[PDB]
A paper describes a structure:
Crocagins (1 and 2)24 are very small, intriguing RiPPs that possess a tetracyclic ring system, which consists of a pyrroloindoline fused to a tetrahydropyrimidinone moiety. Here we use in vitro experiments to demonstrate that three proteins, CgnB, CgnC and CgnE, are sufficient for the production of the hallmark tetracyclic crocagin core from the precursor peptide CgnA. We further show that the hydrolase [name] liberates the crocagin core scaffold, which is subsequently N-methylated by CgnL. The crystal structures of the homologues CgnB and CgnE reveal them to be the founding members of a peptide-binding protein family and allow us to rationalize their distinct functions.
We hoped that the crystal structure of [name] might yield additional insights and determined the structure to 2.35 Å resolution. Intriguingly, it appeared as if the dimer provides two antiparallel channels for substrate binding that terminated at the respective active sites. The catalytic triad comprised Asp325, His328 and Ser79, and the distance observed between the Asp325 atom Oδ2 and His328 atom Hδ2 was within the expected range (1.8 Å). The distance between His328 atom Nε2 and Ser79 atom Hγ could not be determined because a sulfate ion was bound at the active site, which led to a rotation of the Ser side chain. Removal of the sulfate in silico and subsequent rotation of the Ser side chain did not allow the distance to decrease below 2.8 Å. The resulting lack of nucleophilicity appeared a probable cause for the slow turnover and was supported by our inability to label [name] with phenylmethylsulfonyl fluoride. When [name] was added to the product of CgnA–CgnB–CgnC–CgnE reactions containing 3a and 3b, we observed the slow production of 4a ([M]+ calculated, 495.2238; observed, 495.2239; mass error (Δ) = 0.2 ppm), which represents the crocagin core scaffold (des-methyl and des-carbamoyl) and also corresponds to the mass produced by the cgnE knockout. Slow proteolytic processing of modified precursor peptides has been observed in a number of RiPP biosynthetic pathways and may be linked to biosynthetic timing. The intermediates 3a and 3b are then cleaved by [name] to release the core scaffold and make the N terminus available for methylation by CgnL.
Residue numbers in the entry:
A (entry chain A): 7 to 167, 201 to 265, 275 to 347
B (entry chain B): 1 to 161, 201 to 265, 275 to 347
The structure:
């Protein structure tokens, strides 16, 4: 099969496993061990710095400079061939400061914020939190049958089981705007935490294959050939609206904003193998993304 | 068959019928909140499930509505803040505090909430509230009660009403210090919010009938006659440990703390009808509590 042929590492992200967690609803199974992916006792992915030095369990020594990359599966590094090939590892291997992997597979913006609030007190002082996010809230909105504007939603809302707070959606395209509220509210909270914990904050719209203008590599073409939202609902008009909408939110709140889809389109990636699927990145993808992050002042 | 009479609950506390019917809905992340737009003589909730507050001159406040110049404070907690046991919205603590002035008080009581749910409810709605002068937390007991009802627990997250994050409890009494972590962690987030939103913060251990020294009223004697968790797990030894443990957390974080159980034991309430049940207050109880809160400097 193509996925096993070209991206064999994916069989291991299938086995990594999720567990139910109160409030968060889910996180990664802790203590997972494999050559591709390793998680510590709280479910956080290992980070690899220089010469194979591994960091986990919120370990922090004196004088260490620490930063946090927060997001979904792009931050976790689904599609990487190893812990060392993920963004936090690549960022740690370059810059002065080490980076924490606060990526949560399939997390919405609200789960990203909550994961940080649940553990912030164990991390020490952070210089910079970079948020690499956005796409999941758009995706899971269109995968939802019901939605609460004030709270948002998350993927496995099979968890839920006359007046209600979570209301049925009648027209996803006509009610789009409602999903922005959760992002704007979550960003406002990050802004509050930025000043209180004295870290710089940057919001980065994560890359989506259909939104990056790039002649695909032979590998990509074959991988994508194997659902109507990620298709029809996520067209370039959608990108136009979403990107603009998040840039407006961030500007109003004086949050540096960086749209990685536009950044990757401006680079010359024609024919380069960047994606293992429409959402996830290869090792080379992470290398390029990291380069663009550093370059864009988001690190 | 001999004629049937009203249950002691319906005869002495008929308003409890309305609290049974008021309703509870599922909400993501919070897991549950009050059914919105509920109408009854006893209890009313707005479009978000928050209870109505009655200010001076019988004026009702809801929907986070605010006028220019208003001084606003927030009472955050569980069913004691919500006002289960009251005969009307106007007999609840936020209403009693708003009538006294100088500020109007929001009812951020969530029925059955844990400390974590209380914090999340606030983080989900804070941006809509405007400036707050003081948040008063009236809480604690539920985290203890829910810990002893839980069969499983994740120390980093808590709980509410192949490896795992949520671990089974082997001995509640021996693992009971685990529940302090969630309280201390949430309080540190409150402490952080108090600085960023510039409001005063104060913690009040909510009353529990078994923890208040008071010769029972005749109503209370009938009502209490009818879960050992209340019988043996919440004994005076438990009260001693819990109260002292919360005092230590609050002193470390420089948060003013008030043990309402001790405050009420010191007053002359012998024979007075304070408790609708072991956890819920009468109207009279809310007046006593309000006076104690104001005199204690917790408002």
């Amino acid at each position: 099969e193509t996925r096993d042929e070209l991206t064999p590492q994916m069989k291991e992200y299938d086995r990594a496993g999720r567990v139910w967690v109160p409030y968060l609803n889910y996180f990664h199974r802790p203590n997972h061990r494999s050559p591709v992916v390793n998680t510590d006792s709280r479910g956080f992915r290992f980070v690899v710095g220089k010469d194979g030095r591994t960091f986990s369990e919120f370990e922090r020594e004196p004088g260490e400079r620490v930063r946090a990359l927060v997001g979904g599966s792009t931050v976790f590094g689904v599609g990487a061939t190893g812990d060392a090939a993920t963004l936090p590892s690549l960022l740690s291997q370059r810059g002065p400061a080490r980076w924490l992997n606060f990526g949560g597979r399939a997390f919405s913006s609200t789960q990203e914020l909550m994961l940080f609030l649940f553990h912030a007190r164990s991390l020490g002082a952070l210089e910079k939190v970079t948020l690499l996010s956005g796409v999941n809230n758009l995706l899971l909105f269109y995968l939802s049958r019901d939605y609460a504007k004030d709270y948002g939603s998350f993927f496995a809302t099979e968890v839920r089981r006359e007046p209600e707070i979570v209301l049925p959606i009648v027209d996803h395209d006509a009610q789009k705007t409602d999903l922005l509220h959760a992002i704007e509210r979550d960003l406002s909270t990050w802004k509050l935490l930025s000043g209180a914990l004295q870290f710089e904050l940057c919001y980065v719209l994560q890359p989506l294959a259909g939104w990056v203008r790039k002649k695909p590599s032979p590998e990509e073409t074959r991988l994508f050939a194997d659902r109507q939202i990620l298709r029809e609902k996520m067209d370039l008009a959608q990108y136009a609206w979403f990107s603009k909408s998040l840039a407006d939110i961030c500007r109003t709140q004086e949050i540096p904003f960086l749209d990685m889809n536009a950044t990757l389109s401006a680079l010359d990636l024609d024919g380069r193998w960047i994606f293992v699927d429409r959402v996830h990145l290869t090792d080379e993808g992470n290398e390029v993304l990291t380069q663009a992050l550093v370059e864009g002042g988001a690190t």
